[PDB]
């Protein structure tokens, strides 16, 4: 089997991407944030505290003839931005772009934090990291991909995120028309449950390539590119007037600036992030100070190849017995 679904930026800055997902019988279509950095599938629901729902589409398990309450199961997730969600669990039929899984754990939210409430465009998350990170208790549950894996033509999915444009998630096949040149594959460690790999280095603009190992995760659920302080300093040094601001919470730069590209290494291959991918616009409405899309990972503990990096590539999440990651230019 295979599946193919279009993924769309939620706003003009590509702050996140949503992908339509069919849940239940008859189908209830929710727009979910496909997140290769986590392993829960959770949704806004009929059970979510009413004051915490503001515009989102909800899953109503009582209206699904295939929904079954998973007895005694609960879930709770905290995210690094201080946001959070929690609730109970159903199993139900879930389909993505024509690919169907029966008995998928669908984690129904009873509570969500204010950041989720304030964002009407995201109806929940679909995790695509390794199932060891799933938060369901007392019995951990499997990801959509893990459930679909055996049935797929090939045990893979690909992420093809657009810059200010739609893109695609494919399951079970590699679309060889979606990239240029070759796909370079690189080793993955699953020891922390992530798609964790090691970049071979970086360049800033037309600068010299720096060979240096950068261990990080391929994370579609993170907006920006988070890299070591040394690297990030080297990047913003090439932007006149750029400064790290404590009050704003990272590097900002004059909106009139022309941003240099950023290149990262995948083995001997090179992925080039165009400079305008690194512009996330005025820090507040009407400001001439803009927020940078490359930020320091120092306060995180791990480097994160978020959408800013991934959208510059065609990315293969290879879930073979020994998983690997593939990157191609496009
Ligand atoms: O956009 C919608 C949304 C909500 C939750 C997630 C999934 N990724 C999250 C990521 O894990 C968190 N990291 C990012 C890097 O700095 C440390 C904290 C951060 O906090 C929420 C979001 O970014 O996406």
Swiss-Prot record:
Q: Where is the Peptidase A1 domain?
A: 17-328
GO MF annotation terms: aspartic-type endopeptidase activity
Catalytic activity field: Hydrolysis of proteins with specificity similar to that of pepsin A, prefers hydrophobic residues at P1 and P1', but does not cleave 14-Ala-|-Leu-15 in the B chain of insulin or Z-Glu-Tyr. Clots milk
**Active-site positions on this chain:** 35, 199
Report which superkingdom the organism of origin falls in.
Eukaryota
Q: What is its EC number?
A: 3.4.23.22
Q: Which UniProt keywords apply?
A: Aspartyl protease, Disulfide bond, Hydrolase, Protease, Signal, Zymogen
Q: What is this protein called?
A: Endothiapepsin
Give the source lineage, highest ranks first: Eukaryota, Fungi, Dikarya, Ascomycota, Pezizomycotina
């Amino acid at each position: 089997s295979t599946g193919s679904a279009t993924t769309t930026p939620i706003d003009s800055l590509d702050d996140a991407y949503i992908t339509p997902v069919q849940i239940g019988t008859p189908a209830q279509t929710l727009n979910l944030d496909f997140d290769t950095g986590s392993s829960d599938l959770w949704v806004f629901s009929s059970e979510t505290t009413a004051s915490e729902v503001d515009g989102q589409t909800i899953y109503t398990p009582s209206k699904s003839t295939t929904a079954k309450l998973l007895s005694g199961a609960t879930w709770s997730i905290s995210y690094g931005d201080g946001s959070s969600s929690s609730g109970d669990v159903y199993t139900d039929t879930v389909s993505v772009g024509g690919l169907t899984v029966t008995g998928q754990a669908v984690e129904s939210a009873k509570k969500v934090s204010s950041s989720f409430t304030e964002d009407s465009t995201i109806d929940g998350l679909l995790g695509l990291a390794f199932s060891t990170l799933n938060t369901v208790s007392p019995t951990q549950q499997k990801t959509f991909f893990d459930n679909a894996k055996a049935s797929l033509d090939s045990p893979v999915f690909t992420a093809d995120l657009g810059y200010h444009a739609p893109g695609t998630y494919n399951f079970g096949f590699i679309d060889t028309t979606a990239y240029t040149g070759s796909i370079t594959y690189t080793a993955v460690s699953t020891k922390q449950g992530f798609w964790e790999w090691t970049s071979t280095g970086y360049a800033v603009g037309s600068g010299t390539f720096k060979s240096t190992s950068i261990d990080g995760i391929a994370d579609t659920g993170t907006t920006l590119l988070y890299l070591p302080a040394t690297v990030v300093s080297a990047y913003w040094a090439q932007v006149s007037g750029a400064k790290s601001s404590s009050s704003v919470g990272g590097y900002v730069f004059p909106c009139s600036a022309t941003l240099p590209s950023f290149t990262f290494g995948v083995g001997s291959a090179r992925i080039v992030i165009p400079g305008d991918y690194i512009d996330f616009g005025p820090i507040s409405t009407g400001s001439s100070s803009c927020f940078g899309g490359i930020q320091s990972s120092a306060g995180i503990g791990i480097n994160i190849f978020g959408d800013v990096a991934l959208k510059a590539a065609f990315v293969v999440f290879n879930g073979a017995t020994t998983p690997t990651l593939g990157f191609a230019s496009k």
